[PDB]
Structure 1
Amino acid sequence: SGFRKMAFPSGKVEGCMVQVTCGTTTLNGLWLDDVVYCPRHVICTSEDMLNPNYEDLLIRKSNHNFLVQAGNVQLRVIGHSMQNCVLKLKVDTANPKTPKYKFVRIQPGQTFSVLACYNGSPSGVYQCAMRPNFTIKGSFLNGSAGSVGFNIDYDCVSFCYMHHMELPTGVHAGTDLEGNFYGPFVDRQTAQAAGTDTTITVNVLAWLYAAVINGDRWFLNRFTTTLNDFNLVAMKYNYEPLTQDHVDILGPLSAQTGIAVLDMCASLKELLQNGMNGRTILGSALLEDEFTPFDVVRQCTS
């Protein structure tokens, strides 16, 4: 038993991380086959960081200006191109450690593993959720841009996040691997703010199921609610609406525990209206919402 923030094994991604240096700027790149993917702000010079013209900066640059290093080996850049906010550097060597992979743009409330990287060398791995306001609560210092987020399904690495920047509140913003930012953010050092976040309701319910699986059952009761009645309460407390598909996805956890999803919604309703009253759930005094139903299933179910 037990329950912990559990990331996917990072070995398949570690073999793809490279260092990309353009002038005085060094960050991380993702080397898949013969293409290196990295944030386009690597070409950004101190001359204009408020609102640079990335098309102008890319034209003022050639293949030889991009220093790409994989460990001790220098990769030769053969071509470069710009896709939205991501730079693509074609190299003469295909990464022999390229795993089976695909690019995926995830939905808010989904989680992924982040391989934090500096100078092309992985430093650590941890779990992150795509917040409803399209930020993530990561751990990133200067030089960590180009670190990627991912999920691994049947040995296929689904890349979903590339880190770009940190917002004034300390939350983090990035793009998918096609260069499209999550949220309304832009890759410029301007005064930007995320919108007000909301709690991922289906994830809280999954975490409650994980609590029951681990013998934490004090919050349960005999009451049941309708989907409509619960979603009225969820609105009052700044919780995301719960859909019928959310109920279906929680089905395996309901099977494991014996607690109907609408029964667990009644428990969550009472938790929101009364609080924990000094008690804890899975070693936490707050309702955790960064665990998806699939995360609980993969960790707490054989």
Structure 2
Amino acid sequence: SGFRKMAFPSGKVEGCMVQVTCGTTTLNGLWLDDVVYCPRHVITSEDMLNPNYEDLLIRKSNHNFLVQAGNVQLRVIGHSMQNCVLKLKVDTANPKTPKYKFVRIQPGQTFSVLACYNGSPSGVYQCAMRPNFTIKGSFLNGSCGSVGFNIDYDCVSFCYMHHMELPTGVHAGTDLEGNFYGPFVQTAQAAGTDTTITVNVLAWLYAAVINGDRWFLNFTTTLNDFNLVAMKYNYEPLTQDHVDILGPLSAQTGIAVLDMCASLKELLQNGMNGRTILGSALLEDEFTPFDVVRQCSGV
């Protein structure tokens, strides 16, 4: 019973968090095998306005990089820049390296973030890659290098590394190969208009029904008619593959996807009239259909 925004257990990622210092800049890094991954902007405030990163790295040597893993000091024997991440080769392989992969997720997918400062964990929480490729996280100065991940049974899938806090107050970063999610690269950078992850909202309504919350159940509708309503309310268009992913939840609940779409159409056109769903007064869109299944089945 119950339904919570649930993060993956973070023990496997905690063992890979180290502290990287260049000059006076200190941030977090990720230590897997004999390589430490960290944001490349670790290399001044004057540089923050228009850095020629290739030119700034040139002036750097291996001993200019201080990688600390708890109390032990790692010696850097090589450095290279891949897109927007630094890769520092160290003389020791991380003995706590889990089975891992680097994955680039799609907008709408969820992951857990282990927020870190000075290489030490401070907290873990679940969030989602918004359609405009930002995330609404909790990141203070010093959190850069914190990574987002999914755990697919024993294997850690690193998908995010924190790089920046936009003036909007939302956050942007890269995958573990250094490619920013979205158009982001210290200048004014506008994120796109954010929209609601429709397939996630529908999955969350399935979670509600499973947990006894059914007052919003109604009508039917077509994929097209619902999408016309979804476009008006800044909702992502619902495709047939979204309907297929919602299959298992439809079978378990006995509620056809297009029937749930009609209930959501009503919820969008009429609002919630002060009622709550799973203790929320808003429509929640940061649970994937896989998230709902995992929590309700207990994987």
Q: TM-score, normalised by structure 1?
A: 0.98
Once the two structures are TM-superposed, the CA of residue 146 in structure 1 deviates from its matched residue by 0.4
Q: Deviations over 1:209-237 (max 9, x none)?
A: 1111110000001x111111111111111
**Structure 2: segments with no counterpart, 5+ residues:** none
Once the two structures are TM-superposed, the CA of residue 257 in structure 1 deviates from its matched residue by 1.3
Q: Deviations over 1:128-186 (max 9, x none)?
A: 10000000000000000000000000211000000001001100000000000000000
Once the two structures are TM-superposed, the CA of residue 46 in structure 1 deviates from its matched residue by 2.4
SS at match of 1:207: helix
Structure-to-structure mapping, 1:144-293, within 5 angstroms: 144-186=143-185, 189-221=186-218, 223-293=219-289
Whole-angstrom distance in 1 between the partners of 2:17 and 2:81: 19
Once the two structures are TM-superposed, the CA of residue 126 in structure 1 deviates from its matched residue by 0.1
Whole-angstrom distance in 2 between the partners of 1:133 and 1:271: 24
Q: Deviations over 1:283-302 (max 9, x none)?
A: 11100001100000000125
Which ranges of 4 or more aligned residues in structure 1 deviate by more than 3 Å? none
Whole-angstrom distance in 2 between the partners of 1:18 and 1:134: 26
Is the contact between residue 138 and residue 171 of structure 1 (CA under 8 Å) also seen in structure 2? yes
Identical amino acids, percent of aligned pairs: 99
Once the two structures are TM-superposed, the CA of residue 192 in structure 1 deviates from its matched residue by 1.1
Q: Deviations over 1:2-29 (max 9, x none)?
A: 0001000000000000000001100000
Corresponding residue of 1:80: 79
Whole-angstrom distance in 2 between the partners of 1:246 and 1:298: 17
Is the contact between residue 22 and residue 42 of structure 1 (CA under 8 Å) also seen in structure 2? yes
SS at match of 2:63: helix
Give the aligned CA root-mean-square deviation in angstroms.
Answer: 0.7
Once the two structures are TM-superposed, the CA of residue 191 in structure 1 deviates from its matched residue by 1.1
Whole-angstrom distance in 2 between the partners of 1:148 and 1:185: 17
Once the two structures are TM-superposed, the CA of residue 72 in structure 1 deviates from its matched residue by 0.2
Whole-angstrom distance in 2 between the partners of 1:199 and 1:105: 20
Whole-angstrom distance in 2 between the partners of 1:156 and 1:170: 32
Once the two structures are TM-superposed, the CA of residue 63 in structure 1 deviates from its matched residue by 0.2
Is the contact between residue 168 and residue 193 of structure 1 (CA under 8 Å) also seen in structure 2? no
Is the contact between residue 224 and residue 263 of structure 1 (CA under 8 Å) also seen in structure 2? yes
**Structure 1: segments with no counterpart, 5+ residues:** none
Once the two structures are TM-superposed, the CA of residue 193 in structure 1 deviates from its matched residue by 1.6
Q: Deviations over 1:98-149 (max 9, x none)?
A: 0000000000000000000000001000001000000000000000000000
SS at match of 1:49: helix
Whole-angstrom distance in 1 between the partners of 2:79 and 2:73: 16
SS at match of 2:49: coil
Is the contact between residue 70 and residue 120 of structure 1 (CA under 8 Å) also seen in structure 2? yes
Is the contact between residue 19 and residue 69 of structure 1 (CA under 8 Å) also seen in structure 2? yes
Once the two structures are TM-superposed, the CA of residue 48 in structure 1 deviates from its matched residue by 2.0
Whole-angstrom distance in 2 between the partners of 1:48 and 1:174: 19
Whole-angstrom distance in 2 between the partners of 1:209 and 1:48: 49
